[PDB]
Structure formats: structure tokens, C-alpha cells
Design a protein around this ligand. Structure first.
Ligand SMILES: [Cl-]
Ligand SMILES: [Cl-]
Ligand SMILES: [Cl-]
Ligand SMILES: [Cl-]
Lengths: 216, 215
């Protein structure tokens, strides 16, 4: 069963460089072009370039010729993607993908049938920081404000998983300080404010958990 | 270089009915080897993209007949029949005739009866105030369609430039959206004003609604 497995999330200062790898299996590594594509967050897809794992030769869209090299290890059938002179707007999820058919001489002509899970690379001068968590105190709505953390992601659940109905965890926004902020909210029967207790459970790898009670 | 235009940019569909997306290219995608280099990809919320159709009209393995890709030259169409919640997501076209480019994506969502947001406002916790910052939160909950507008007021003065917001994906059960907005002030600015007001305009509302509090 064909599988492209990428390496984990990365954070970099502007100006630094990053290497994402892509470990492939389930087919003859050397027989298929491998393609990279990225996505800036809440944005479209942007095609980066392609490698022939047999010859090693590559091709990049103009925007990436300066700064991307692609390389390959045939013994471990892994492909490596290296992006240098990083800038904040390189912050994106990076995907590797495999062409549908075997090498046809047409490398950019590729159909991305099998994709990695993606690698988040965030470029920012911020430094690692776990959130402060504040109550959104109150059919009635209550919540948690998960504020001033970096980098993505956090996870949030309510009463340790129990409560799922009526829950909305919103996508984080990036503040002017370069830390993220996110809210999680839940609607609930007005008549439960007196009776049930509500707790949001917040995890920030790396590496931080907070449990916060919601009363009133 | 080659430009891809997709319309519409968002497409609501009643469960059961058909959807059509156009993809138009700035020049022909037919190569001299006789292939039409246009592929459609689907990206479902929080997943990788996946291939639906390659070369104008070939289904990728596992994609059901419900998906039909066609056209040629500078005009292509993806038709989706019998749309269900599982099809919701952004559909991109992509040409590989030259250096590949994507179109900008078509958001496909489930059409439902218009629904007015329930609005809530949350004061900043005494807890966060200890440290110089005040965040005031507004929740616009369970509405449809997606366009909605939040305006913040502070002693009735219109706020601009000091708020951020985001929206959930469509609930595949109830087909609504929710929106969260955050006004950040400094503790000092927060303590010198009294009325904090969340003003909301939607299409499900006969006129704009306000939720507010004092302190
Ligand atoms: Cl294969
Ligand atoms: Cl439109
Ligand atoms: Cl599908
Ligand atoms: Cl079928």
C-alpha cells in the first residue's frame, strides 16, 4: 500500500533554512517522480518543484529556483526538500506527492496521486511559549480563551472528552506580537449553569497542559 | 505564467442536487502528444489534498461516477452529482501543460435554509486583567450562510483595526457556521470606558442585533 511519510513540524527564525523529508514505501522508489507543493495557512496550493529519484535532476517553479534544492537517498527511498533564506511568508504546510504513472520523461507533467500528511514549517522570530487560558464566563454560551502561545497547534476538549455536543473550537489568529490566540466555546442549557461543571482541557505540545474551570 | 480561473469561488448545494465548477485557463492545456493537462484535486477540511480527476476526464481510483470531469483546450468542467456532506471542501484545478499552476479553489458547501446567528458577548476575565491586556469576545453561533459582519463599539465609538476573527467549518450535521471575534484593548483603555457592544449584521436578521455589557 503506497505511503509517503513526512517528518514532523519545524520552527525557524527568518533567514535560517529548513529540511523536510519524505519517506516513501510500497513501490519502486526510483520509478516515480516526486513533487512538492505548499500551502500558506487559509490559502491556495502552490506548486514548488519536482525530482527524478533515479537521475537526481530537478525542476522548480521560478519563485523557488533561488532557494529550494531537492535531494534523494535511494538506499532509504527518502526525498529531501531544503528551503533556505526563510521569510515569515514561507510559513506553510509543505507536502510531497508521487506521480500517478511511472516516469515518462515529463516531470512537471505529474499527477499527484499519493500525498504526504504534510509538514508545518513556521517562520517567525517568536519563541516557544505556552498559552494563558482565560474563562469565557456566561440556552447559554460559555468558553475558554487560549491566548499568547506559539507555535501552532493547541488542542482543546471539554470535561476531559465528555462534552462534544455544541462545542466549537475556532481556528487560531496570529497577533501583532507574533503569538497565536484561539477561542473554544460551547452552548449549553441555561438550566445547567447552576448544576453542571464545565472544564476545558488545553494541550500545547511543546510542552504544556492546562485544565480550566468555567463557573458563574 | 499560465493562469487558472475557477468559478464560482464558493458554491452552495442542496443535499442531493448537482454542482458544476468551471476552470478556465489563459491558454490551451492540450500538448502536442495529444494529452489535456488538467487535473482536479479535492481538499477536505483539515486533510491533505487528493486527486479526483486527471487529464480532463479520468477518475482516480476510488472516485465514484458521481464525479465527472470534462472539456478541453481552455475550458474544463467538474460536475458532482448527488452531493452529500462528505463532498464538502475546496476543489482546485491544476495545469501541467507548463510550469504547473493551480486555480484559486472553489469552496463547495451544503445549502440550507437561512439561519440567524445567536450572539453572545464575554467580558475579559478579572484573571487576565492583572497583566495589562483586555480581550472582549463575541460569539456568533450556528448561522447560515457564511457572510456575517461584526462591528465593535466602546462607549458607542466604532472600533477599527483592533479586532481579529475566524470562522468554523460547516457543521456537517446542521450545516451552519460559527464565528468568533476578539477585541483587544489595554487594561488602561479598558478601565476608562463602560459599555462594550457587539453589533452583528447577517441575512437572517430583520435588522442588526446588539449584545452588550457594562464594566
Ligand atoms: Cl504503483
Ligand atoms: Cl462567487
Ligand atoms: Cl471522494
Ligand atoms: Cl463507481
Amino acid at each position: 500500500q503506497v505511503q509517503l511519510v513526512q517528518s514532523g513540524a519545524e520552527v525557524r527564525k527568518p533567514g535560517a533554512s529548513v529540511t523536510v523529508s519524505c519517506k516513501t514505501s510500497g513501490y519502486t522508489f526510483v520509478n516515480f517522480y516526486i513533487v512538492w507543493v505548499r500551502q500558506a495557512p487559509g490559502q491556495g496550493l502552490e506548486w514548488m518543484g519536482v525530482i527524478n529519484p533515479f537521475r537526481g535532476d530537478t525542476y522548480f517553479a521560478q519563485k523557488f529556483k533561488g532557494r529550494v534544492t531537492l535531494t534523494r537517498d535511494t538506499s532509504t527511498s527518502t526525498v529531501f526538500m531544503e528551503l533556505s533564506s526563510l521569510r515569515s511568508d514561507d510559513t506553510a504546510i509543505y507536502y510531497c506527492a508521487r506521480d500517478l504513472e511511472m516516469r515518462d520523461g515529463n516531470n512537471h507533467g505529474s499527477h499527484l496521486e499519493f500525498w504526504g500528511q504534510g509538514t508545518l514549517v513556521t517562520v517567525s522570530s517568536a519563541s516557544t511559549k505556552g498559552p494563558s487560558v482565560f474563562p469565557l464566563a456566561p440556552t447559554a454560551a460559555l468558553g475558554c480563551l487560549v491566548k499568547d502561545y506559539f507555535p501552532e497547534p493547541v488542542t482543546v476538549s471539554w470535561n476531559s472528552g465528555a462534552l462534544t455536543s455544541g462545542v466549537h473550537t475556532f481556528p487560531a489568529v496570529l497577533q501583532s506580537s507574533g503569538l497565536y490566540s484561539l477561542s473554544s466555546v460551547v452552548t449549553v442549557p441555561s438550566s445547567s449553569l447552576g448544576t453542571q461543571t464545565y472544564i476545558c482541557n488545553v494541550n500545547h505540545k511543546p510542552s504544556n497542559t492546562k485544565v480550566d474551570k468555567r463557573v458563574e | 505564467d499560465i493562469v487558472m480561473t475557477q468559478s464560482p469561488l464558493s458554491l452552495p448545494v442542496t443535499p442531493g442536487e448537482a454542482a458544476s465548477i468551471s476552470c478556465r485557463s489563459s491558454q490551451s492545456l492540450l500538448h502536442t502528444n495529444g494529452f489535456q493537462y488538467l487535473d482536479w484535486y479535492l481538499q477536505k477540511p483539515g486533510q491533505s489534498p487528493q486527486l479526483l480527476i486527471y487529464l480532463g476526464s479520468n477518475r482516480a481510483t476510488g472516485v465514484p461516477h458521481r464525479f465527472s470531469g470534462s472539456g478541453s483546450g481552455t475550458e474544463f468542467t467538474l460536475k458532482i452529482s448527488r452531493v452529500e456532506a462528505e463532498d464538502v471542501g475546496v476543489y482546485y484545478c491544476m495545469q501541467a501543460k507548463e510550469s504547473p499552476t493551480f486555480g484559486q479553489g472553489t469552496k463547495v458547501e451544503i445549502k440550507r435554509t437561512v439561519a440567524a446567528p445567536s450572539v453572545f458577548i464575554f467580558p475579559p476575565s478579572d484573571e487576565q486583567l492583572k497583566s495589562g491586556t483586555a480581550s472582549v469576545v463575541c460569539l456568533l453561533n450556528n448561522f447560515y450562510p457564511r457572510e456575517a459582519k461584526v462591528q465593535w463599539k466602546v462607549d458607542n465609538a466604532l472600533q477599527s483595526g483592533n479586532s481579529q476573527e475566524s470562522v468554523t467549518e460547516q457543521d456537517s450535521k446542521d450545516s451552519t457556521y460559527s464565528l468568533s471575534s476578539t477585541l483587544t484593548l489595554s487594561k488602561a483603555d479598558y478601565e476608562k470606558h463602560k459599555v462594550y457592544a457587539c453589533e452583528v449584521t447577517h441575512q437572517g436578521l430583520s435588522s442588526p442585533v446588539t449584545k452588550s455589557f457594562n464594566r
